[model samples]
Target chain A: GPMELAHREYQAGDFEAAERHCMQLWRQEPDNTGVLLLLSSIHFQCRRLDRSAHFSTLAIKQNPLLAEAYSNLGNVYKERGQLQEAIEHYRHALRLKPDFIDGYINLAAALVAAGDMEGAVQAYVSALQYNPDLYCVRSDLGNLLKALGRLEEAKACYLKAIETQPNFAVAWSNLGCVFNAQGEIWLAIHHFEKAVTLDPNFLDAYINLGNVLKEARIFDRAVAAYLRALSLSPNHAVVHGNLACVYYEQGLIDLAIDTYRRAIELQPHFPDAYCNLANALKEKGSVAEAEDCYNTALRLCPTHADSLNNLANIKREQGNIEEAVRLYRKALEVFPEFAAAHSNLASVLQQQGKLQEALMHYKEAIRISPTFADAYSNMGNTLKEMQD
Target chain B: GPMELAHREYQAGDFEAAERHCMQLWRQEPDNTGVLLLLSSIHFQCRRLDRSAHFSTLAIKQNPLLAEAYSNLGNVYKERGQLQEAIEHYRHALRLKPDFIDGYINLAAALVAAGDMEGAVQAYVSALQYNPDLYCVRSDLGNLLKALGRLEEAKACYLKAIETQPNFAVAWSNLGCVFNAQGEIWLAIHHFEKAVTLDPNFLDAYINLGNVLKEARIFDRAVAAYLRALSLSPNHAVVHGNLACVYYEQGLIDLAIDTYRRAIELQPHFPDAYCNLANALKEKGSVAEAEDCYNTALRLCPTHADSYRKALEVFPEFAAAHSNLASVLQQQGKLQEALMHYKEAIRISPTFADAYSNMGNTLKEMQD
Candidate 1:
C-alpha cells in the first residue's frame, strides 16, 4: 500500500520524490514489473525519454506479458522521435490487448508524426470504435480533420466528443476552430469562451479565442486571450509565435519583433518565428539583421517560401535581377500558388526583356489574388511591350 | 640560546619569527651589547627600521668602540633618508676603523645622497688607495665617472676593477655599460656576455647585453637577453619597460602594446609606459583607447606641465599627444598655448584632420 505513493507523487508532479520512491522499490524487488513500470511512467512524465525507455525495457524483460510496459515503451520512442519504432511497439501492445484504447491513440500519434495522416485517422477511428468514451482521442481526430480542410467531418467528430464528455475543453475549442473556419465568428467566440470556462488552463482554447477576436478586430479581448495563454505557458514557442503574428497584424511591428525573438530563443529551430521576425525587422528599417534572420530561417527550413520570397526582394533591390529570379522561382517551387512571389518574378522578368514570360506569371499572380492591382497593371504593360 | 635561534630563523628567511626571538633576548639582556646588536640586525632584516635604529643606538652607547654598531646605525639612517646623520655615523665608523672597506663604501653612498657626487667619487677613489684590491670601490668610481661624461676614465676604472678581481661580475657589467653608452656595440656585447658567464644571475649584465644587441639590430638576441633578465628579476619594472622599447623598435606593434601593458601593470605610476602604450595602440588604429591612455598619463601627474611636456620630448612625432595637450590647454583657457600645440600637431602630421578642426575651433573662440 505504501508503494502506491509513487504513482500519487508522479500525478502530483513531484517527479523527484516519485523517482526516489520508484528506485527504492526497484531495489527491493528487482523482478517486480509494477515497480519498474512506475519508474518508466515517472521518467516519461519528467521528459527523460532515454531513462524512461530503459525502465520500460526492464519492465518488459521482467514480465513479457505486460502490455502496458510495451505501450510505455512506445510513448518513450514517440517522445524521442523514433516514429517507426514507436508504431511497432504500439502495435505490439494493441495486439496483446485489442481493447487498449490508449495503444490505438498512441499508434495514431506516431503515425501522424511519421506523415501517414490517413493511417492516423483510421487508427483514431478504430480506437473510438472500440471505446466511444475517449473524448480526447475524438478531439485529436477532429483537429486532424480540420487541418485536412474537411471542416464538416471535423465538426461531426468534435460534436460527438462533447456529447460523450460534456466538460471536454479540447472538443469545445476544436469545435470553435471549425466554426471560425466557416465564418461564424459569433458562434466561434461563444464555444471558445465555454471551452476556457470549462478548463481555464486550456491553451488551445485561449489561442482559438484570440484568433477569432483578432479577426473581428476586437483587439482588447484578443490581446487579453493571448496574454492569458502566455501566462499559462510563458516559454511555449507556438504561443509566442502566434502572439507576434497578432501584433504585426495590428501594425505593432516592434512589439511583434520582440515576441518573435522570444519565440526563436525558446525554440531556436522555429523557422516560422524567424521568418516573421525578419519581416518585422524589414518593416522597421533594419535591413541587415533582417537579411540574417531570413538566412537563418532558410537554414532551418530550406523550403520556407516566405523567407525565399523576402530574400529575392532584397536581391532585387541590390540590382541582382538574375539571383532574384532564381530565388523567386525556388520560392514558387515551394509554394507555387504564392501570388507575391509570382508578381515579383514577373517584375524581374519584365526587367530582363522577357515580356511574354512576364505576362504569363503576372496573369497567374492575378488569378491567385484577383484584386492584385500591380499584377494586372504589369500584365497590361507587358502586353503593350509585346505589341510594340 | 634565543639569540642563536634568532640568527637561525633570520638565515632561514623567517624574519617575523627571528624578530620575535630577538625581542625575547633583548628583554632578558637589556644592557648586553651583543644582545642589542643582534636585535638591531634582526629588526633591520624585518624592515622595522625605527626599532633597528633604536637598538643600534643602544648598542653604540653600550660600547662606543663598536664600529659594527655605528655602521648598522648608519645603514638605518641612510634608509630613513637622514643622509647627514647617516654620513656622520659612517665617518665615525671609518674613524674608529680607518681600513674598514664597507665603512668607506657606505660613507661614499651617503655623500652621494648628500648631493656631493664629486665628494662621493673622491671618497670611492680614496678608499681604493687604502685597499688597492677593493674592486667594488673601483666599479663605484667607474659609475660616477660614467655619469660625469668621462668615458675613457670610466672605462679605465672598470677594466682595472675586473683586472683586480677577475670574477667580479659587477665590474664586468659596468665595463659593458660604458662601452655601450660610448657606441662600441661589439665590445659592449662581449663584456656583457662575459659578465653573465661569471655570475649567471647578473640582471644588469643581461640588460646591457639586450640594450647593445637591440641597437645593433640583433633583435632575436636582444629579446632572448631581455627574457633572461625577466627570469632573474621578474618584477623589475625598468627592465620590462626597456624591453617594450625594444619590441616597438622591432616594428612588432601588437607585441609592443602587450609588453607595454605588462610594464604598466608591474609599475602603475610609470607615465612613460602609458605614453608609449598610447602610441602603440594609436599605431594599431585604435584611436579611442589611445586617447584614454593619454588622459591616464595626465591624471597620474595632475597639473604637471613638465610631465606632459616630457611626453612630447619622448615621441616628438606623436600627433595625438600634441592635439590632446592642446585640448587640455584649451580647457584651462590658455588659448595661445593651445594654438601653439595645435600648430605643433599640424607640423608633426599635416593630415591630422582633428588637429586642424580643433585649431579652427580655437581661432573661432579667440574672435569671440
Candidate 2:
C-alpha cells in the first residue's frame, strides 16, 4: 500500500502539490533512486509521459544498473506511443536484471504495440508468475489476446484481473471491454457499472463503459455514461473521440461531427479523430469533406495504413475504382500484412470489371489473412459471378 | 365641268405613264371626261372617289332618265369600297327617281372605288343643286381638304360643316387632333369643346374631348368623357387602352396591369395590346416577361420592325436587328462568325452611340 501523505494530494486531484511533494522527497535524499522512481510513476499515471521519462532517466543516470529505472523508461516510451523504443528499453532492463515483474509486463505491452501478439502473451504470463500483484497487466494482456483473435483467453484474463483486484478500475473497465467484444453486452454493462463505482473519476473507464453500452444498443444509458465522462474531463481527447463513435453508431451524425471536431481541436495530431470525423461526414452525405479529412490524417501521420484502406473504401463507395485500387496498393506497401487493404482492393477490382484481376486480389487476401471472413464472402461472390 | 371617263388606278411607279397621259390629254381630249377626271390631278389621287363621282355617271348609263342605272350598274360603286351594295341602292333610286343625277353620282362613285380628288370636288359642286349637299355631306369635302394637310382651310370647312351638319364625320375625326398632341393642349381643348357643343349626340367627339382634356391634365373632365364613351360603347378597345395609359401615367401600376390584361383578352391578336403589357412588366422590372411579350409580337408578325428593334435594344449587349448582323458581331469583338451569332448583336447604323459604347466595352474586354 502507498503512503497517504503525497497520494492524498493525488487523490484530491491536486497535481501541482503532489508533483511538488514528490520533488521535495527526492531532494531530501538526493542519492535515492526510489523517490525518483516514485515521482516518475506519478507522472506516468497523470499521462505526462515526457516528465515521467525525465525522472526515470534520472534514476538510471544515478545508477546505470537500476532495473526499475529501465522498466519505468519503457512505460514512458509506451505512453508516448514510441512502441519500438519502449520494447528496446524494456529488453535492456531485463538483460540488466531478470525477474523484474514490472519489466516483463511493460515489455509485453511494448511487444503488443509492436504487433508481436504471441510474444506479448508469453511475457504477460511470465510477469504474472513472478508477481501476483500484476493485476493491472491482465487487461493489457487481454487486449493483445483480443487483437490476436484468442477470445476465450482474452475473456479469462479480464475476469482473472477483476477477481484478483476488484478495486482496480482498469481491470473492471477492461473486463467490460472483453465481454463487449465477445457480444455479451449485458455482462459488459455489469462490469462497467462496477468499474464506475470503484473509480468514479476514471475518465477512460467511463468512456469504455459508454462505448460498451452503446454496443448493447442502449443509446440512453450510453449517452448518460458519455455525458458523465465529458462532465468529468470535458477536453479528454480519447473520451471525446469515443463519445463521437457512440453518436455515430446511434445515427446522431450531427452530434458525432460536433464531438469529433472538439476531439480534433483538443488533440490536433489525433489520427482516429480525423478518421471518425470522416465517417460522420460520409454518413451526412458530405463525401467531398470526408475525403479531405482522410487526406489530412494521412498527411499528419504518413504511416497511417488504416487511413489508406479507409480512403480506398470511401473512394470505392464514390465509384472511383481506379483511385481506390491505387490507395489499397499504397496501404499494402506501407503494411504488407494489412488484411483490410487486400479485401478492399479485391472489391475495387471487381467494381472495375476486372474479373481475373479481382480474383487474384481475393486469393492474395485469403493467403495473407486466412481466417479473414469478409475476404471469404467477397471471394465467393467473385467466383459466383465468373460461373454465371 | 366634269366628263364621262372612269377612274384610273394610282401607283407610284407609273408616274411616267401618268405624265405621258397628261401630255396626250392636253393634245387630244383637252375638254373630255378622261382629261377632266384624271389628267389634271396628281398620280397618287388618280383613283380618288371624289373624281370618279364627278364624271362617267351620265355617259355609261343606258337611259338618261334612269340616272342611277346609267352607272350602267357596272359603274355603280366604282368610286368606293362597296360596289354591289352601291348598285342595288342605285337601282332602288332608279325605280323611285329616274332623273336623279345624285343617284348616278353615288353609283359611279362606288364603281370607281371613288378615285380622283378633282372628281370629288366636281361631284360635290354638282350634288349641291340636288340636295344643297347637307351638313353631313359637306363634312366629306372638309375631310378631303384636311387629309391634304391644309389644316387652316380644313378647319374652316369642318367648322362650317359642324355648324350646319352637327353630326358630321370630319368635325368628329379631325377636330384639333394635330394641336392636341404637339404640346398645344390648351388650344386643342378649345377646338374640342366647340366641336362637342355643336353636336349633342356626337359620341366620337365626346371621346376626342376626353383625350384632349387628358393631355391638358384635366383629369375630372377626361374621366367624365371616358365614362360617357364607355356608356356609349362598352368594348371600345382603343378608348380602354388609352384610359389605362392615363391611369398608368398617374402611378396606378396594379390598375394599369389589370386594365392592360382585360384589353388584351378582349382583343387577343392585337400587337398594341401586348406592347402595353410589356411596358407594365418592364416598369416592374420583370425583364424576362417583358421580353416575352415583345417576342410574341415578333412571332405573330415577323415584320414588327419596331418591336424587334426594341427587343434587341432591351439588352445593350444584343441590339439592332437590321444592317449586317456581321457588323455588330465585329463590334462584339468576335472576329469569328460562329461565336458572333451566339451573342448576335448586329448593328444597323455604323456609329449608333449605344452600339459603339457596347462595342467599346467588348473591345476593352478582348484586350484584357
Candidate 3:
C-alpha cells in the first residue's frame, strides 16, 4: 500500500511527499529494488543528484538488470553535462530493454549536445522505426536537417510530421522556415499563417510572418504581425527592434527612433538598435551625436563593421581623411566583403588624388556589390579625373 | 517737398517707394548729389549691389568730398567681400569726416573678417576714442578678446560694458562664458543666472547655466535650467537633448530615452540625441538597438579618437573598451599604441582572452 501511495505521489508531481513515502517504504523493505528506484526518482526530481545517484546505484546493485535504474542514471549524468557518461549509460539501458523509447530519445539529445549530428539523427531514426507516429520527433529531426542546409530533406521530414498530426503547429511553423530558406516566400507565408490558425497563440509563427513580410516590403502587414507578437510577449526586445526597422524602411523616422528607444529600454545591450538609430539620426543631420552612437556600438561589439564604416564617413567630413581611410580599412579587416567600406575608402582616396588606388578600391566595391550604382558612378568619375 | 517725401518713405522702411521718389527727383535735378546718395542707400537696402555702386559713384563724381557717398561705397564693397576696397573707402570717408564712428566700426569688422585681429582691435579702440559711451561696442570688443584668449582684457571690457549698461544681458552672458572657460564655475553660474534674471527670455543664458551646472554634476538644477529653456522655446531640439542628457546622467534611463526620442522627433538630424540614446540603450542591455544608433551616429559623423579615450576616463577598468580601442589603433598602424592599450586591457582583466589574442597579433604586426 505504501509503495502504491509513493508511486501515486510521484505521478501527481509531489516530489517531497513521494520521497517521504518512499523513505517509509524503503525502511520497511530495505532490499526492494522497486522502492529504491522510486526513491531515486523522487530525489532526482528534487534535484538532489547525489542522493538520486546513491539510490539508483543501490537499486542496480540489488538488481543488476534494472533498465529503469540505468536510464535514470543516464538522465542524471546528462543533467550534469557529462555527455559521454550519459550516452554510455543510455546505451546500456537500451541494451537491457531494447524498446526503451525514453532511452533512445535521451541518447539522441546527448549526441546532439556532443555535436554528433549524424549519431543523433540515427538515434531519432531508430526511435521512429519503433514508433512511426511520433510527430514531435519528426519535427525535431527536420530542424536539425534544416540547420545542416538539407532543405529538401528537412521539408520531407516536416511534411511527414504534419501528415501524422495535421494540427501540430510547431511542424507547420518549422515547415514555413524551410520554405522561407528555399526562397519560396509565398509558400512560407502560407504555412506561417496556417501555424497561427492552428494555434492562435503561436509567438514564433507571428515573428516569422513579420520577418518575411518585412523582407517582402509589405510593411503594414509586418507591423501588424510584430504587434501581435509583442502583445503576446511585451518584453521581446528583438521583436520590438525588428518592428522599428520596418518603420525605418517606411521613412517614418520619428516613429522609428521612438520604437528603437523602446527596444533599447527593453534590452540595453542591443548594438543593432543603436547602429540603426544612429543611421536615422545621421539622416536628421546630427553628426556629432551620431559619432558618439557609433563609438558606443563599437565599444559594445569591437568588430562592428557598420559602426566602423559609418564613423569613417564622419572622419572624412571633418577633414580627417587619413583617419577615415584607416577606419574604412579596419572595417574591411573585420568584414572583408563590406561593399560600403570599400566604396567609401575609394571616395576618400580619390579626393586625395590617388587615382590608381581609388580605382582599385572602387573595383573591389563593385565586385563585392554588383548592384552598387553609386560605386560604379564614382569609378567613372575617377576615370575621368585620371584622364588616361 | 518730394525730397522730404523720399526721406520720409525711406525712414518708414518703404524702400521701393523711396527709390521711386528718388528716381523722379534724380531726373528733375540731375546734379543733385543728395538725390544720388539717397538712391544709393535705397538700392543698398534692397541688396541691388550694382545699382547701389552706380548711384554712390555718381554721387561721389558730383561731389568729390561727399563723405556719406564714400562710406556707402565702402558698405557695398564689404558686402561684395572685397575687404581691401572696403577698408580703403572707409579710410577715405574717415579722412573726409574725422567723426565717422560707423566708418571705423565697419572697417574693424572687415579687418576681423580678413584675419587682422590686432588691426580690428585698434579700429575698435579708435571707435571708442571717438564715442566712449558705446556699451555695445565694448561688449563686441570683449568677445574678440575672449576669442583671442586674453581673459583679463576680456573681463575688463565686459565689466566696462556692464558699468556702461548694467542691464545688458548679452554682456553678462558673455562674461559668464569667460568665467566658465577660466574654470570659475560658481562665478559663471552666478553671472548666467543674473543674465536670465535681467532678461527672462534669454535662451542663451539659460542654456549656458544648464551647461555649467551639468559640468559641475548638479544634475537637478541643470535639469531645471534646461526645462526652463524648453518652456521658453518648446521646440528647441538642442535643449531637449541637453535635458535628456541630464536624465541619463541621473540614471533615469526610461525618461532619458523618452526625452531623446522627443528631441529627435523635433529635430530629426540630431546625431547627438541618437548617440546619447544609444548609450542609454546599451546601459539597459539593448546591445543590438544600441549598435544601430551608433551606426546612425557614425553615418552622421564618422570620427572619434576622443571617444575611446573619454570612455577610458569614465570607466578605467573597461577591458573591452580598452581592447577595442587597441584594435582601432592597430588598424591605424599605430602598433606601439595598440600594444599599450592591449596590455592595459590584459592588466585590467587578467582572464580576458581576447585581449591576449589581440596583443599577440599586435606584436606580430610590429615585428613585420
Candidate 4:
C-alpha cells in the first residue's frame, strides 16, 4: 500500500523491475489511469520529456480529471523553454480544479520567467490559498520580490516563510542579502554564515559569506570562505575572483594575479576579475599590463559600475580631469548609487574653480550615503571658504 | 578631475603612472602609510601572492590598525592551505576590533570552514554582539545549527532572521530545505518558489525545489526546476543526477542510465550515481552487472548503508557468497559477522569508500 516494496526496487531504481512492473501493470489495466499515469510520470522522470508529454496527453484524454496529467503536460512545455505552452497546460489544470496548488505554482513559475513579476505574485497567492501551508513557495516568492526591488514586501514574505517553516537556510541567506543591499554588511555576513551552517553543502551561502568578508576587509576569512565554496563546487568563478581580491589586498600581487587568472580561466566572461586584476597590476607598477586587464573587464561587462568608477579615478589622477569627468559621468549613469564617484567628481570640479558644479556633486554624495561624513565635512569647509 | 584623463595614459594600465604617482607621493611624504598600503594592496590584488605577502607585512608594520591588512594576511595563508596559521591571523584581526563586524564574520567563517561549525557559531555570536544590526549573522547562525542537526534552533533563528530582513532569498531557499528535511514537501515547494523569484541566479534553490517537486510527484515541474538550475550552473552534477532520477522514475531506463553516466562523468568519484546506476541496471534485468556497480559504490564509501542493503539483495546464498562473507568478516574483524555477509555482499565490491570508513570504524570500535 505504501509502495515501499515496489519503491525499494524503485529506490534502488532498478529499471528492469520497473519496466517489468509497468508492462505487467499496463497489460492488466491497459486503460487504467493510475497505471497510465504512473507510466507517464516514470517516462518524464527519465528525461524523455517528449515521451512524457505524449503519455501525459493520452492520460489526460483518458481521464480528464487527472491533475497530474495536466501538470505533466505543462512540464513537457516548461522543460523545452516553451514558457507560453507550459503556462497554458498549467492553466488548464488549474481551471479543471481551481484548487490545484501544484498547477498554480507551475503557472506562477512560468509567469515569473516571462518577467511578469506582478502576475507571478498573484499566481503564487492563488496557489497559497489552495495550499495555505506551502512555505517553499512563499520563500521563492519572497526571493522574487527581492529581485524586483520590493525589499519591504519581500522581507515580509521571508518572515512569513519562517513562520511557516523555520530552519530554512536559504531563507536566512536571502535575508542576509536584504541587509547587504542596505549596506548592512555585518548583518549580511551573519545571515550568510547561518545559511552555510544549515547546509554545509550550500556553496552559494559560502560565496555570499566570502563577499561580505571581503567587504568588511576581513580578507583572509573571505579567502577561506571562497576557497571552501570552490572546493564544494570547483568551477565557481565568483569565489575564485573574491579569493583573488583578498590576495591582491594582502600585497600578494603575484598570487592575486594568478588567482584572477584562474578565475578568468574558469569563467572567461567575468568582468570583475579582469577589472580587479587590472587595479592590482596598476598598483604593482605594471601600468600597461593593468590597462589590458581593465580593457578586458570593459570588454566583458561594459556597463559594470565599479569598472567605470575605477577607470574614472585613474583618468583623473593623470590630470585629464576633462576625460576623467566624462568617465565619471558614464560610471554615474550606470550606478547613480556610487558615493565615491560623486565625491571624486566634486573634487575635480573644485580644482577647476567650478564651485557650483562641485557643490551639486558634493550634495549628491551626501544624499546617497547620509553617513558620508567626510563628504559633508569637506563640503562645509568649501562653503566657508567660498563665503569668505 | 575623475582621474580618467591621467588614467587614459595609464590605460595600457602600464604601472608607470601609478609608479610615477607613488614616487611623487613618496617624495612628498617618504613613509606615507597610504602609499605603502596601496602598493601592498596592489601586490595582493595582482595575484602575486608572495609579493602581496611581503607588502602586507610591511603595511602591518606601518599601521597595525588597518583591519584590511590583518585580514588580507590571513587570506595569503589560507590560499597556501595553512589553515591553522590563517585562523590565527583572522583572530588577530578580530582582537584589534572586537566589534569589527568583518573581523568577527571572517573569524567565524574560518573556524566553521576548518570543519568546526560549533566554534564558528561562537565567532558569529561575537560578531552579532558587536554589530547587532547585522541581521544576516543570525541567519548564518541558524543555517549552521540546521547543518549540525539542531533543526529546532535553526528554525527559531530563521524566523528571527525573517523578522529582521524579509527579502532574504538565501534564507528563503534554506527554508525550503528545512521543510524538505522534515518531509513537508508542499512547504518546501513554497519556499523554493520564493527563492527563485527573488533571485534568478539562485541556482541551488532551483535544485532543491526540483527535488521536492519530484518527491511531491510533480515530475514535470521538478524537471523544469532542475533544468533551470542547470542553465544557471551548467556543470551542476547534482542537478544532472536529479534529472536522471526523474528519468529513472519514468522508466526511461536508457535515458536515466545516460543521465546518471553524465553526472558520474562530471564527478568521477560520485558514489551515489554508481548506486543509482546499479538500480537502473538491475531493473534492466542485469542484477549481476548491477552488483558490480554496488560493489564500486562500497569501494567509494564503506558504510554506504544503501549499497549494503541493495548489494546483499542480489546474492542470497549463492556460491559467490562464501568467500565474500569470509572477506567481509575479515575486513570487519568480525569473524562471525564477516562470515555472515562475506559470502553474500562480498561478492559485490572489492574496494568501497563505505568499506574504508566502516571497516576502520569497526576495527577501532571492536576494542572499545
| All DockQ scores | 0.00, 0.00, 0.00, 0.01
Per-residue accuracy of model 3 over A1-388 as CA lDDT, tens digit each: 3357777877788877877777787788877788788878878888988898888999999999998899888889999989999998989998998888877888889999999998888888888889999989998888888888888998999999999999999998899998788776656877888899889899999999999978877687789899999999999999989999999898898888888889989988889888888887888788778888888888898889999999898889899988998999999999899999998999988988999999999999899989999999999999998896
Q: Interface RMSD (Å) of model 2?
A: 47.4
Docking class of 3: incorrect
Candidate 2 lDDT by residue in tens digits, B65-84: 43333343334244445666
Question: Per-residue lDDT for A80-199 in model 1, tens only?
Answer: 788888898988898888888888888888999899998999899999899888888888898898899999998999999989999888788889878888977756877898899899
Deviation of model 3 at B139, angstroms:
92
Model 1, residue A259: what's the lDDT?
Answer: 91
Q: Each model's fnat?
A: 0.00, 0.00, 0.00, 0.00
Candidate 1 TM-score, C-alpha based: 0.37
| Candidate with better TM-score, 2 vs 4 | 4
lDDT for model 4: 0.77
Using DockQ, give the best candidate's number.
4
**What value of lDDT does candidate 2 attain over all alpha carbons?**
0.69
lDDT of each: 0.86, 0.69, 0.88, 0.77
Task: Candidate 1: give the clashing pairs.
Answer: none
List model 4 lDDT by residue over A240-301, tens digit each.
Answer: 88888888887899998888898899989988888998888889888777767777788888
lDDT of 4 by residue, B222-329 (tens): 788899999999899878988999989967888988899899989978888989999999888889989988888778875544333344456444434444444556
Off by over 4 Å in 3: A1-32, A384-388, B1-368
Please give the lDDT score at residue B14 for candidate 2. 54
